Each structure stands twice: as C-alpha cells, then as structure tokens.
Design an enzyme around this catalytic site. Structure first.
Site, PDB file in Angstrom:
ATOM      1  N   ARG A 122      12.276  -6.141   6.700  1.00 30.85           N
ATOM      2  CA  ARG A 122      11.156  -6.997   7.115  1.00 30.85           C
ATOM      3  C   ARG A 122       9.884  -6.474   6.431  1.00 30.85           C
ATOM      4  O   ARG A 122       9.907  -6.229   5.222  1.00 30.85           O
ATOM      5  CB  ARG A 122      11.024  -7.003   8.646  1.00 30.85           C
ATOM      6  CG  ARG A 122      12.226  -7.622   9.374  1.00 30.85           C
ATOM      7  CD  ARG A 122      12.024  -7.628  10.871  1.00 30.85           C
ATOM      8  NE  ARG A 122      13.056  -8.408  11.548  1.00 30.85           N
ATOM      9  CZ  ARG A 122      12.949  -9.692  11.888  1.00 30.85           C
ATOM     10  NH1 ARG A 122      11.846 -10.391  11.615  1.00 30.85           N
ATOM     11  NH2 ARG A 122      13.960 -10.285  12.498  1.00 30.85           N
ATOM     12  N   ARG A 137      -3.262   5.998  10.955  1.00 30.64           N
ATOM     13  CA  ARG A 137      -3.354   4.705  10.317  1.00 30.64           C
ATOM     14  C   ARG A 137      -4.421   4.752   9.220  1.00 30.64           C
ATOM     15  O   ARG A 137      -5.591   5.058   9.482  1.00 30.64           O
ATOM     16  CB  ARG A 137      -3.661   3.610  11.346  1.00 30.64           C
ATOM     17  CG  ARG A 137      -4.008   2.274  10.725  1.00 30.64           C
ATOM     18  CD  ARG A 137      -4.015   1.109  11.733  1.00 30.64           C
ATOM     19  NE  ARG A 137      -5.002   0.100  11.329  1.00 30.64           N
ATOM     20  CZ  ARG A 137      -4.912  -0.669  10.246  1.00 30.64           C
ATOM     21  NH1 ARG A 137      -3.868  -0.594   9.441  1.00 30.64           N
ATOM     22  NH2 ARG A 137      -5.883  -1.538   9.971  1.00 30.64           N
ATOM     23  N   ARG A 149       0.811  -1.214   0.000  1.00 29.58           N
ATOM     24  CA  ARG A 149       0.000   0.000   0.000  1.00 29.58           C
ATOM     25  C   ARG A 149       0.844   1.264   0.000  1.00 29.58           C
ATOM     26  O   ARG A 149       0.401   2.283  -0.508  1.00 29.58           O
ATOM     27  CB  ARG A 149      -1.029   0.047   1.138  1.00 29.58           C
ATOM     28  CG  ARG A 149      -2.091   1.131   0.919  1.00 29.58           C
ATOM     29  CD  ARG A 149      -3.315   1.039   1.874  1.00 29.58           C
ATOM     30  NE  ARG A 149      -3.731  -0.337   2.102  1.00 29.58           N
ATOM     31  CZ  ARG A 149      -3.875  -0.907   3.298  1.00 29.58           C
ATOM     32  NH1 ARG A 149      -3.674  -0.223   4.426  1.00 29.58           N
ATOM     33  NH2 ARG A 149      -4.230  -2.176   3.362  1.00 29.58           N
TER      34      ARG A 149
END
Ligand SMILES: Nc1nc2c(CN3C[C@H](CO)[C@@H](O)C3)c[nH]c2c(=O)[nH]1
Ligand SMILES: Nc1nc2c(CN3C[C@H](CO)[C@@H](O)C3)c[nH]c2c(=O)[nH]1
Ligand SMILES: Nc1nc2c(CN3C[C@H](CO)[C@@H](O)C3)c[nH]c2c(=O)[nH]1
Ligand SMILES: Nc1nc2c(CN3C[C@H](CO)[C@@H](O)C3)c[nH]c2c(=O)[nH]1
Ligand SMILES: Nc1nc2c(CN3C[C@H](CO)[C@@H](O)C3)c[nH]c2c(=O)[nH]1
Ligand SMILES: Nc1nc2c(CN3C[C@H](CO)[C@@H](O)C3)c[nH]c2c(=O)[nH]1
Ligand SMILES: [K+]
Ligand SMILES: [K+]
Ligand SMILES: [K+]
Lengths: 243, 243, 243, 243, 243, 243
Positions: free
Chosen positions: D43, D86, D25
């Site tokens: 990661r 978020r 995203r």
C-alpha cells in the site's frame, strides 16, 4: 388570522393557559368548570375556554413529546399567554417513596429533549416560576391533598432499547422525583419568552418496574380529580392578576 | 480529625451555613452578628461560628470559582449541612434594569462550570430550594429592601479572550439576570447531596460595559449591609427548624 | 489603578512569576529568599516580591481551582509576566512508582477544566514551555533531587460522586503521572498570551487510595524545601534573561 | 509472519524509527545514509533499514492522514519501536514569521483527528517527548540550520468547504505555528504506548494564501536536505541509547 | 391485551403500516380505500385497517414530533410491523427547484431529534430501505406524477428563536431537499428493529420565506390525492409479499 | 496544471471513477479491462484510465483512511467526476451471517471519521446514491454473484486500545453489516459536491475474532475477481449516461 396548529385566533388567547398532553383530558377538565366554550380541534391540539370561579382561561392539549408540545407552547407564548401550567402524568423515579396515583408539583426539569437545545445552550436551566409553584402548593394544601415536590426528568425516550444505557437510574440517584416528556420544554420556552410556567403531574407507574406490571395508563380516578381541582384552582388564582 | 480544606471537625458544622467568596467578607459579616467564634482559616477557607437572633450557624468563605468552591461545598454537604446560602457579588446582564449595588435573589443558574458536569449530566438543572428562595425574599420584604429575582449565569470565565465568542450575550437574550462564578455549582451539589440551597447577590458592575468603567469591586456600602442583613435574617429563620 | 484581584499595579509585575495555590505557601517561600517585600493580600491572592541569587521576581498565590487561578494568571499575563512557574501539590496516579512526597516536573496537562475551553477549542494542547521544563530539571539535577517527569491531569473535580464515572483511572492507564487542578489552565492561558509556563509538584497522596489513608496535606517538609529550592533556582536563572 | 500493513516482521523493527508521509521521501532519505536495505512496500507503507553514523534505524512512510498513519504507528509501537520521529511537511499559520521552506520542530499538536479521540478522551494532550524535541533542536544547532519551535495543528481536513468554518484562523490566533495531518496522532499513540515521539516539519505553503499561489508541493531542495540531515542526525543520536 | 398508546392488539397489526402525522389525514386516506375498519382513536393516535387492491394494511397517525411519533413507531415495530411508510408534509429547502405542492420521496434524513440519539450514537445514518424507496418511485411514474428525490432534515424545532442560529441554511447548502419532523426517527427505529421504512412528502411552504407568506396548512388537494395514491399503491405492492 | 495529490489534470478526469484503497488493486483491475493507460502515481494515489465494454473511466487508489481519501475524493469531485464507486475490503460485523470472502453492497455508512464532521454537522447522513446501489446490485444479479446489502461502519480506528470501548459491538447490535474506513467519507463528500456514490466491499475477516486468527488480507481470489467484475460492470453502465 389563525395560529397554524391551534387554529384559534390571538384574540382568543387568555393570560392563563392550562395545558395537558391528552386531548381527552381536556374534555374531563371542561366538565368540572362552571362552563366552557369549545374553540378548536386540529391534530392533537384541542382548545377550550374554561370558566371557573369567576375567571376565564384556556385549556389546550399539547400532545405526546417535546417537539409537538413546543409548537403548541410557542403559539401560546408569542400570542399573549403570560402563565402556562402543565397538568400531566408521569412515571415515578423513587418507587419506595412515590407510588402510582401520587401527585408531584415540580419546580425544575432535566432537559433530555432536543428542541430546548435548539433554542438555548444546554447549560441553561429548565426551571419553573416560583409564584406558579407556590400557588400550586397552596391550592393542594387548601384542598388537603398530599403532594410531592421535586425535579422531573423530561425525556424524549419512552421505550428504551438495550444499546445505549438509559440515564433514568442516574437521575434517580441524582434525586429527580419523576419522569415525563414535556415539562423541561415548557419551562425553557417560557423563560425565553417571559411566560411563567409550572407543572403538576400524576404518577401512572414506575419505568424501573414495568416488567413487573407497575403500570396503568388509566389514571387513578379520585387522584386525577384531585390534580384537576388543584390545577383549576391555581389557574383561577393566577388569572385574577390579569383580569 | 479535621476536614481537609476547612480544617474544622464534623461536629463544628451547623445545619445552616452562610457561604461567601471573599474571606474578608466573613469578617464583615461576623461583626454584625450578636457574637461569633473564629474557627479556622486555611487557604481561602475562613470559617466562623455566627450567633444571631438566638440561632447558631457557620459563615464560611469558599474562594473564587467553581472548582475551589466545590471543595468547600462538598466538605459541608457530606458532614451535616442541611441548608447553604451563598451571599455573593455578581455582574449585571440586564444593564437597563439591574444596576451596580442592586440585589438579586436567584432561583436557578446556568452551569458554565466543569465540576457539576463531572458530577451529573449537563441536562440536569442547577436550581435552588424554593423554600430558601422564599425565606430570602420574605426577609428582603420585611426589611423593606428592593430586590430582583432571576437566573444567574455561573461562568468559569471572568476575562474573555478574542477567539471563542462568550455566551454572556446569548444568556442576557435568554433572560438571565446576573453573572457570577459559584452558584450553579452550589445548587447541583446541594441537589445531589439533599441539601437546600439558595443565593443572594450584589451587583458590582456590568461585564458588557467594563470598557466604560462600569465596574467597582468595592461593593456599595449600604447595599452590602442590606444584603448581609437579609442573608443573616434568612439563616436564623431557617436554623430554627433544625435547632 | 490596581489589578482587580491581585491589587498590585502593572509596574510591580516582574518578567518571572512563581505561583502557588496556597497563600500560606507564599510565606514558606519568601522566607528562604535573600529578602522580600510584601505587596498585597486580597481574597486568596497573596503577592510578594522575592529577591534571590541577585534576581527579582514575584511569588503570588492563585487559590484552589481552575476558574479562580485563571483570574490570577490573566492578571499576570496581560500586565507583563513573561514566565510563570507553578509550584504546587498533586496526587499520584501511579501509586507503585510515584509516592507521597515525590516531586514531579510536568511538560503537559489534561484539560479537565472549563475555563480553557471557553478560551480555545478542546483539541488544543495544554503544554508547557520546554525551556522552562529543561531549567526545572537542570536545577533539580544540580541540587541532587530525584524527580519524576510526565503529564498531569488538571481536574476541576476533587471529591467524586458515584453517578458519573471519574476519568482518573482512564488517564492513569494512558500514563498520566499525577493529578492536580490548575496546571492545564496555566499552560493554555500562557500559550494564548505568549507567556512561557511550567510546573513542579509535590505528591500529597494517591486519590485511588484515599480510603486506605494514602493522603496527608502536611507536605513532607524536606521535599517541600527541596521543591522550593528547585523552583527558586529556576525562577532566578530564567529572570536573568529579562534583567 | 508479518505485520499486517507494513509487511515486515517484529524483528526487523528497530528501537528508533523515522517516519514520513510520502513513500517517495523514503527513497530520498535512504540515499543520504551510509547504506540501506529495502524491506517492503505495501500500500503506502515503504520500509527501509537505514545505516547512518554507525547506527541502524528504520525509515517508514505512513501515508496521508491520521487514520492511515495510525495503522503504521500502532504496528511500530506494539512491535518494539521505542522512538518515532516524524519528518513531514506542513503549512505555515504565521505567514509573516514562518515562510515557505522554513523548518519547525514541534513539541505539541492540536488533535483535529478522530482516531486519537477513539483512543483517549479529548482533554488529553498531544505532546511530544522532551528528549526527542531537545535532540532535534541540538542537531539543527550543530548543523547551523535555523528552525522554529511551536505547536502544530493536525487536521483531518485539507480542503475546506463553505458550510462549517475552518478552525485554522482560530488556531493561528491561539499561536499555533503550522498545520499538518499526522503529528497529533503520532504523539497520542506514542504517549499511550510509552514511545518517545517528535516532529520536524518543512513548510510547503500557507493555507490562508493558497489563492495567491503561496503553495508548492515541490519542497525547497536545500531545506529538505537540511531537514533530512537534522532528522538523520537525531535518529542516530537517539539510537545510540538502545544499541 | 392492548398497545399502550395505539390501543390496539398485537393481532391487529399488519405487516405493512402507512403512517401520517395528522389524525385528520387518516380519514382522508381510508375514504379512497376499497373499504376499511375504524380500529381505535387514543390521544393523537388514530388507527384504521385499510383494504386496497386486494391487500390489507394499517393506517395509523403518529402526531407532531419525534418523541411522540417514536412511541407510535416502537409499538408498531415491536408488535409485528415489517414495513412502515410515512406519508407526510414538509417545507422546501430548495425553493428555486421544489415548490409548494411538490412531492418528495426521501432516501435518508438528518437526525435533528433527541430520541434517535437516545437509541444509537449520532454517527449512525438515518436511512430508508431501498426497496421501499424504489417501490414509491415506481408507483409515482406509473401514476404519472413527477416526484423529487433527496434528503430530508428531520428537525425538532419548527419555530426558531433569535439566539442559536438554525442549521436549515447549512443543510440547504449541503443539498438536503426538504424539512419535516419525524422521518429520521422512523428511519433509525426501523433499522434498529429490522423494519423496512420509507417516506413520501408534500411541500406546504418554505421556512426561509414564511415572512414572505410562502406557507399554507391546506395541502393542495390534487397533489395530496396524488401522494396518497402513490403511498397506497406502494403499500399494496409491499403487502403482497407478506400476505 | 496538475491536481496536487493525484498529479493528473482536470481534463483527464472522467465522469465515472472507480476508487480503491490499495494502489496494488489498481494494477489488478486494469488488466481485467479491455485496455488501459497509466496516468500518474504520486504518494498512495495511483491513477489509470480504464477502457471497458466501450466505455472510458478512471480507476484511482485513495489510500488507507478517511483524511487521506478525502483528499482524493475532493480532487475528483471538484474537477468533474459525476459518479464514484468505491471497491474495497471490509470486516464482518455479523460473523454468523457474513463470512470472509463475501461481498457486500452498502447504501449508507456510520460517520466515525473526523473530516466529514469538519464539512457538515454529525446529524447529516452518509448515504449512497440509490441508482448506483441499484446498478451494483443488478450487475451482481446478472453475473450470478450472491451479495449482502447493508450499512457499513466507517471507522478511523483499526487497532483499538483498552481504555475507551470500541463502538463496533453497539453498531453490530444496531444491525450494521460491515466495517471499513473510507465509505462514509466518500458518501458525505459526494452528497455535498453533487456526486453520486456507492460502495461494494469484500470481507477479509471479523474484527471481533482477530484473536482467533479470523483474518487474511490476502483477499479470496475468485471473490475479488467477482467483486471487480461487478464494479467494472456498473462503472461501464453508469458511464454510458455521460459519454
Ligand atoms: N417518559 C415517561 N413519561 C411518562 C408519562 C407522561 N406522559 C404520558 C405520555 C406517554 O405515555 C407522554 O405525554 C408523557 C407517564 N408515565 C411515563 C413514563 O413512565 N415515562
Ligand atoms: N463572571 C463574573 N463574576 C462576577 C462576580 C462574582 N464573584 C466575584 C469574584 C470575581 O471577582 C468571583 O468569586 C465571582 C461579580 N462580578 C462579576 C462579573 O462581572 N463576572
Ligand atoms: N485533584 C487533585 N488535586 C490534588 C492536589 C493539588 N492541589 C491541592 C489543592 C486541593 O487540596 C488544589 O489546589 C489542587 C494534591 N493532591 C490532589 C488530588 O489527590 N487530587
Ligand atoms: N492540513 C494541511 N497539511 C499540510 C501538509 C502536510 N502533509 C502533506 C500531505 C498533504 O499534502 C499530508 O500528509 C499532510 C503540508 N501543507 C499542508 C497544509 O496546508 N494543510
Ligand atoms: N420543521 C418543519 N416541518 C414541516 C412540515 C411537516 N410536518 C407538519 C407538522 C408541523 O406543522 C409536523 O408534523 C411536520 C411541513 N412544513 C414544515 C416546516 O416548514 N418545517
Ligand atoms: N476498520 C476496518 N477496516 C477494514 C478493511 C478495509 N480497508 C483495509 C484497510 C486497512 O486494513 C483500510 O483501507 C480499510 C478490511 N478489514 C477491515 C477491518 O477489520 N476493520
Ligand atoms: K479559589
Ligand atoms: K493514507
Ligand atoms: K405529538
């Protein structure tokens, strides 16, 4: 037709039962009665029928700790017992006031076991029956034996480790009198099963002072005798109601 | 120098205090005494000095629910009260045995609050003083008033919602007799502060049967009079010891 | 039929309700309205119909503590209230920033009660309606009244004992701004019943500093006046969308 | 000398950070900005500097689930981030109201993780900052994008088993709007670290109706571009305050 | 001098100890040894020094239940025991696979006691030593006794009531194989005290089917013989390392 | 069609799967194999089919932290995986015994997550399959690589705050050997889904001494090579039993 752990029949269960932790203690109690009948001895559960002052009641050992005593109490409660009195030992949580040898008659207990919580939510009180408590106090004063009254901590932990702090000092500050391992379990089981319960206990030391040698599991002989006479007295008095 | 919520001084606190939830009930009680002195009325806390049978004790309302009653009880216990008796109402958890207008004298309580738990670990019993309990029962007996004995559920929830199952039925199955909202908090605070406590309660309905109309908060008149007489009787008897 | 504790009928409940803990505060508020009608006074629950800036809304007292105020809030939420605003007092948890007499408008609260947990799992947030919060802040700005914003600890314990540590300092370190006793309960009940909630609070002292004398429950009168005008301003603005 | 998991330095951290779960995203967002600079990818943590409407802010992926997102959020919060939004996906818990592709801007969250609980007691609310919530709402309004507002359930369990019932339906009944896995963790960490947080979320399905195929991992294209525009909008507005 | 409950000295404790719940079982085991020495019998704690295949190890009974057996295990672990194997009975939780008389060697256990929680947090695993588990399995194959392997539920409740549902069915669905009452306590104590532990267990019934008469206290003789042979074989193998 | 997060099909799932936290580590492992085939890379989940010593098995990255890895493990376990071995890093909880670069093979884990608790009660042990543990150990032996055996703490907290004490110290005292973030979750999911599991971990520092600079996530190259060879060895040996 026998109970799984007590190995006696339902027909042999009296309305009144005196329970103790130590199977050896059953033999000391029975020789104080007018007569007895040995019934069974399976695992740590020793059962004797006591005859005392014209009355008939069982004396049964329940072993060390809540899980093992619970199987004893359930077998008794679901098979005819109406009154169960625990006559035990304990440690003192008020060392300035309550000394080795002293006798406490307890009305309520702290539920630091698991089995009571698997039977009923933690918020439920471990409380003994007032009548049983009242008659234990009445016998003690009739026998001119000084006794203390208060709450017992019933804890599943005897030997604390140093990772998780023990709550015993918390409970001492909360004014709990003594500590043992079985009373709360008896109280809760009795309430759920409509059996009247009570507890009388003899101090064997102070867990706060074990590292100073404030411990002896040889119970003070004349006080053990006193406690027994109080317990036996109460049981006979309570047994008359159901005889 | 007034107590923060009761707005009376430390010297106005008597050894024995009768507590009720409803400030309006304080006025019902005071007029039954030999005389009284109105002391204060702040928030839900109404305090009156009661004169009865030659004895002197406060009657103080504590309001609805455990957090608000704890504020009252702490103020009393930390400033000289030695005995506190709650005269309240309750619902029945045994609708087959205990009906609207019946009177229960309770020895222990289920701790379904939060305050007690912020004071002491949950395993600790909410138990009343067995000598207060005895006095209450003896007064009921002498007045020829039938009463019930048993454990009260003290619950912070009055109006259940549909998401989390209420534990009321569990406690009925566990043999709890009645439900109110304050007794467990009084008992635990009393035990921690060395104050003798007790509870007498009048049934106003059954919470399992509210949807059948089994509720009336106008307390049954002659039974309320009886409960008050019992409570006042016990207070004066207990007060004689500290006089 | 009247509501059980509020003793007003369903038809007297307005879309917007202003709630306060102190029944004596209802009289302070009603007196700065254009007009009012006294509705009822039962136990700690005083209800008044306020008329302000062309709008109609109730002002109701809820008493001290989460269990008793939950009874009030449930009677309101299930009988028509759409917006509930608490105007209360609180203690400071940030004594270097938030001082006696300061006003805090809170968006969320710590659930240190029991009743909310009997309604919904503990993981669920006690959170206010953000538009009510916005309205409160905007009214404060129009009135040129400096306010603080942040999280309130809603705790059922006012008087700590010395056995279990109080979590108040932990929450202060976590940046909670203030402490009172009712707001999380209101928030949770509101969320569950689809009622918009908010809270504005005047500092009465600092519980970390009570032994320094940092306390006075005579609220700073010009700040109390200010909080009432903010609250009344907000209720009227919100009531217009339901009128 | 780099942050341990983000592998960027403290000076590459901007006051405003936009976080997403999916590293994929990050690449969809960066392409919509006026320009960007790729920073690191270690990661599941991809970091990009976004330039948008004259402002600069980081866009960082946090990966799936609370324990791994907390590593990301702690590294941002302790190294200079003042604002974190978020932009994630979620399941609908109100299938009749909130459909696949709909956008929810959340003010609060259910703490069904563990990491928040290892940081602060469970009673503490997971709540977002008002100004962030307001800004997100205002940008959606300006872009004429319809949105929902409500509480998100942040659950560490995505695939339920048949032994312990899931609490999702409980929370649906409690009026939680949506379910995801990271938001409560962000909110608590933000409150503790004095970082303003918020959440905007796009529905990908309904967990109550997965067995009926009400799930697509491929997010509705025009709604995703809408959500991205709102978030980029809000980040630029907020960044102006710290520039 | 002597251990408080075992009533033996530190110097009588061997590196390897075989433990059983029933004092009666100690008598059945010593008989199959090459020789033995009765050491002590106090309460439910019977101790015997076994001589088997050239090696020397204790056999000690621990009684029914976690709190009582914890007293035994602590006295052993703090006074020189390095390896403890419990040889007990159990109920089956997989009645379709594991039937009366079957033997199970258990690697781990469910902690449904209290005493382990009073020593270390609940998240800590009750797990046995792999070497002890390996030895037990190796001994069974050599003696040609088919055995099962799995998790044991160690539960303080033997007789469920009808209020709180038992977790036995949940744990059956979780693939736990058997249920008894002591193994989790042994495992945790051993881990904490750096003592290798393990467990071998004979099925005596199925608690799901007690009402179907699927239970017998008399353990099937040839399987008890087999289990004891395995256990004694394993103890001797393990003893050789510390000799 | 494809698993939701792994984005591979059921038919691409092998009986044995090696799982790692870091997608980067999948690339390191696949080039040590005899050959491989890239399958998918979605979010933090990289999937590769490994061909080694005549066997075929998946190597899949699970990302950081319990909730995200549970998503991976459930997809694997519900679609045919029989054996899952985690090869991870960890911190040392015994810094005087276990140093940076050392390899630990763990049999059990502390359940400091949430997801395991949403699947099965906390009392249930997180324990590995003992054959997997044995195989890993025998592989290390044959490659002459020294290893430690022990319990891992699986913790959702990597960066502690200063409000609630971390339990790491308690677990060190309880003899846990290492700390990571995913092993307990794997173990519990495996047990529930009848999948054999195990864990081998390389030490990257000590969390008690991070402020001393005792940390480097650049894993010691020759020990990482050694761990991988042990892991690959065990997977091949275990895969022969299903091939
Ligand atoms: N917990 C505890 N119990 C006791 C007891 C009472 N019983 C003695 C026996 C263990 O010694 C158990 O049955 C409980 C005496 N002293 C103590 C003590 O200091 N602590
Ligand atoms: N929880 C509960 N309490 C009561 C009470 C006792 N008090 C009455 C008052 C609320 O009506 C509180 O102070 C508690 C009477 N009936 C009931 C009942 O049905 N439920
Ligand atoms: N818990 C708490 N509450 C308050 C309040 C708020 N209300 C005031 C009243 C108790 O005095 C309750 O209704 C709660 C003001 N100051 C404080 C404080 O220091 N502590
Ligand atoms: N728990 C949950 N989370 C989500 C999400 C949100 N994120 C999507 C990703 C797992 O697919 C995690 O980062 C959380 C979308 N739909 C759902 C759902 O149905 N359930
Ligand atoms: N809880 C439980 N334990 C056992 C045991 C094992 N021991 C037998 C004894 C109780 O009879 C305890 O020491 C545990 C056998 N069968 C069962 C059962 O059905 N249930
Ligand atoms: N909790 C914890 N985990 C680890 C790990 C293991 N993984 C490393 C990665 C976060 O650094 C997670 O997937 C867990 C290495 N060192 C440490 C440590 O000091 N602490
Ligand atoms: K009140
Ligand atoms: K992750
Ligand atoms: K026992």
């Amino acid at each position: 037709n026998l109970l799984r752990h007590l190995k006696i029949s339902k027909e042999q269960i009296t309305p009144v039962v005196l329970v103790v932790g130590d199977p050896g203690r059953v033999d000391k109690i029975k020789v104080v009665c007018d007569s007895y009948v040995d019934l069974a001895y399976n695992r740590e559960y020793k059962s004797v029928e006591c005859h005392y002052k014209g009355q008939k009641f069982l004396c049964v050992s329940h072993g060390v700790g809540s899980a093992g005593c619970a199987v004893c109490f359930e077998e008794l409660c679901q098979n005819g017992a109406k009154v169960i009195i625990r006559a035990g030992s304990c440690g003192s949580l008020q060392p300035d006031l309550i000394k080795r040898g002293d006798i406490c008659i307890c009305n309520a207990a702290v539920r630091e076991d698991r089995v009571s919580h698997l039977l009923i939510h933690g918020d439920f009180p471990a409380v003994g029956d007032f009548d049983v408590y009242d008659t234990l106090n009445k016998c003690a004063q009739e026998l001119n034996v000084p006794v203390f009254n208060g709450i017992s901590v019933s804890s599943d932990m005897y030997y604390p480790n140093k990772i998780i702090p023990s709550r015993l000092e918390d409970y001492s500050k909360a004014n709990a009198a003594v500590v043992e391992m079985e009373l709360a379990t008896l109280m809760v089981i009795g309430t759920l099963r409509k059996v009247k319960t009570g507890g009388i206990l003899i101090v064997d030391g102070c867990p706060f002072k074990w590292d100073e040698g404030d411990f002896d599991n040889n119970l003070v002989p004349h006080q053990l005798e006193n406690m027994i006479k109080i317990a036996l007295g109460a049981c006979a008095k309570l047994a008359t109601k159901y005889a």
